[PDB]
Ligand binder design. Structure first.
Ligand code: HEM
Ligand code: HEM
Ligand SMILES: Cc1cc(N)nc(CCc2cc(N)cc(CCc3cc(C)cc(N)n3)c2)c1
Ligand SMILES: Cc1cc(N)nc(CCc2cc(N)cc(CCc3cc(C)cc(N)n3)c2)c1
Ligand SMILES: [Cl-]
Ligand SMILES: [Cl-]
Lengths: 362, 362
């Protein structure tokens, strides 16, 4: 019944895809070719056109994403041809370079060979292609706590981190047939980072905060027409709150709010002073200012919500149902100042889409 | 089948209520009495003990309420004895006085006679017992836009507002048998208001903002054991964000953020400046400071969330399932700084509870 699931997904995808591409007349013959191919080989192979539009539809269907207005301009890189670790490594390096684009970030996805029969051809261990290591031992915490398990796994493979608060994790991935993943250090010339300063508060630089330019999610599966692309890293540019209200502020992440309060010169003693809220706003102002000053793409949550409003309007105008997850779409700073907060969204799952998958380590 | 719905709700309520009250042995005889009474009269009458605990359970089951830690100290006033408009009016005046308690607010509910056969005995028109009128005509907007329809209805009944931004609406309610509601002006001596000032920014008083002390919801139905108390106004004290991030900030309410930005001396020109977020924090700081300075009860969203965490713990320790609506429980200012944001809640409906009902006017 594996094949029947595949055939059914394929039928729905090809019909929808070709309809959007004005290719509806070709659906008939294409599906026949696909049915023979499944009968024969147990699977089928997407055309470049199908793969590209599939990855775009998958972004368009991502309920939790506020950035979807730009779904149709996704840059899709087809790497279904890779067979070696060196090719995978080089393709990941290339993704970083071309997505970064000297700071003018290009939303990009690199697509590797798909699962054959649930059997991965390439298995990426990183959560993002660029991320900081984390350490916790003898009560001492260093770096990003979110990376502790992956960092420990890396250090089992012969890697060693410098134990700064911002060590770049190496790329780590496993090839079909290999028992152990390989790891490769990131060339620093490929990785843009932004030091965090504040537009008005000179002392903010005393915190010595920085973040990386481009979030490149590398642990999710792209599913298109029943084909499972478990290895298909993708990136956008950041919304500022992701850095300033989550990565740097969260108590289980960099946990910087008390330090922020101190450098902006407010007490951190009384809940009624709303010092956490004030620190959050100033940290978030600093993040946006810093990315802008450096010429690295970023969007603030107000502008992002306005773009998302246009996405909603575009969907209605195209006759497409809109799906969304309110709990993820609202920004974590002043959510009620956005239109998103004041409406509801159908959280139904539509494919093609991106999905969570089990981690290959613990 | 009306009766069967009633009997079934009654059975579940009485069993649960008496169990919590350590009265489980009396459930048997009480249910027999109730069954006879329903057979006879089509309904049944709660004991004072049942009514009081029922209203408390209803608060405890209110999924959208962050204030539930204090459910068991609700002050329940039994006014099932009222028969005249003067008695209803006087009971509403009394509720305001005793709930206000010179600023040390007491969570209180006044319970009027229940619906007989869907037939209301008392029909309250106000959304809250204390609220400001709103006007919109010839492009001119005055007061609270949320009150526009009710205000227009009042002005059909012979009332006239002064058309300040803070006119107190009169009490308005209808008795069974009467075609028209009556209205009564609130004695100003009963109504505490708080002028909004900022702890550090002297100019904030130039905005001439104020709000009323006590939110007394008067348009919801209390349902206990199948009995429908459509008229049962209840109050708590405010959480500061309700005033500073909703009532005064919302574009469809008092819409004060641009004016706040001006008095705190920041530009309101660029989304990336996060001026709306900064204005929201300062307005919210001002609200808490002002209520505290005046000696009127209020809670900030951090303290409220910590209290709610204790409510969760208390529920687990008592063996009670917890229900909640994440979308209402998170505060609209720095939600991710509260524990609520980082967990999920079962939004199932448990009775006794408070419910929306159709408005008696348009
Ligand atoms: C172009 C700039 C982009 C911005 C500003 C953006 C913004 C965001 C934000 C802020 C979130 C997380 C919301 C939260 O934590 O509550 C998110 C989630 C997501 N975005 Fe986007 N995004 C962008 C591009 C992309 C692209 C190119 C894709 C894929 C092709 C994508 C797919 C997703 C997915 C799948 C999630 C959910 C991840 C999960 O469930 O863990 N986004 N986006
Ligand atoms: C003691 C102080 C109290 C505080 C601070 C408090 C806090 C709140 C807040 C902030 C909300 C709205 C959340 C939002 O808009 O997202 C709310 C909703 C609610 N509260 Fe409470 N509350 C308190 C007391 C009470 C009492 C005494 C009752 C009833 C006996 C009650 C029942 C409710 C109900 C029914 C709602 C939802 C209203 C609706 O659906 O429109 N609360 N509470
Ligand atoms: C492609 C892309 C671009 C872009 N700018 N941002 C993303 C999302 C990045 C992201 C990364 C992590 N580690 C966690 C979350 C959600 C954290 C989270 C967790 C839970 C549980 C709830 C919630 N609201 N948010 C989101 C993807
Ligand atoms: C007894 C009691 C005490 C206390 N402190 N606060 C309340 C709630 C008062 C309240 C009043 C109004 N008008 C609207 C909302 C919800 C506004 C709202 C609407 C929607 C649609 C979503 C959302 N999250 N919030 C809440 C009751
Ligand atoms: Cl991130
Ligand atoms: Cl209110």
């Amino acid at each position: 019944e594996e094949k029947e699931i595949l055939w059914n997904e394929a039928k729905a995808f090809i019909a929808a895809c070709y309809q959007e591409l004005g290719k509806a007349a070709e659906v008939k013959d294409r599906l026949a070719d696909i049915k023979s191919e499944i009968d024969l080989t147990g699977s089928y192979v997407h055309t470049k056109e199908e793969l590209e539009h599939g990855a775009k539809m998958a972004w368009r269907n991502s309920n939790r994403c506020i950035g979807r207005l730009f779904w149709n301009s996704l840059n899709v890189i087809d790497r279904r041809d890779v067979r070696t670790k060196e090719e995978v490594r080089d393709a990941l390096f290339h993704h970083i370079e071309t997505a970064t684009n000297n700071g003018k970030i290009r939303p990009t996805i690199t697509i590797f060979p798909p699962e054959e029969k649930g059997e991965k051809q390439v298995e990426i261990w990183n959560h993002q292609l660029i991320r900081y290591a984390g350490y916790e031992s003898d009560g001492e915490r260093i770096g990003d706590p979110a990376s502790c398990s992956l960092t420990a796994a890396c250090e089992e493979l012969g890697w060693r981190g410098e134990r700064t608060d911002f060590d770049l994790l190496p790329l780590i991935f496993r090839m079909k047939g290999d028992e152990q993943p390989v790891w490769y250090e990131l060339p620093r010339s490929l990785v843009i980072e932004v030091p965090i300063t504040h537009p008005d508060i000179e002392a903010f630089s005393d915190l010595e905060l920085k973040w990386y330019g481009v979030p490149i999610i590398s642990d999710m599966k792209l599913e298109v027409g029943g084909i499972h692309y478990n290895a298909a890293p993708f990136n956008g540019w950041y919304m500022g709150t992701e850095i300033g209200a989550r990565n740097l502020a969260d108590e289980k992440r960099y946990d910087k709010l008390k330090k922020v309060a101190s450098v902006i010169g407010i007490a951190a003693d009384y809940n009624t002073d709303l010092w956490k809220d004030q620190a959050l706003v100033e940290l978030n102002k600093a993040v946006l200012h810093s990315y802008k000053k450096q010429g690295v793409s970023i969007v603030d949550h107000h502008t992002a919500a306005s773009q998302f409003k246009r996405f909603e309007e575009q969907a209605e105008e195209a006759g497409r149902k809109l799906t969304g997850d309110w709990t993820w779409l609202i920004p974590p700073i002043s959510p009620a100042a956005t239109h998103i907060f004041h409406r509801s969204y159908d959280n139904s799952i539509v494919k093609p889409n991106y999905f969570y998958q089990d981690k290959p380590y613990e």
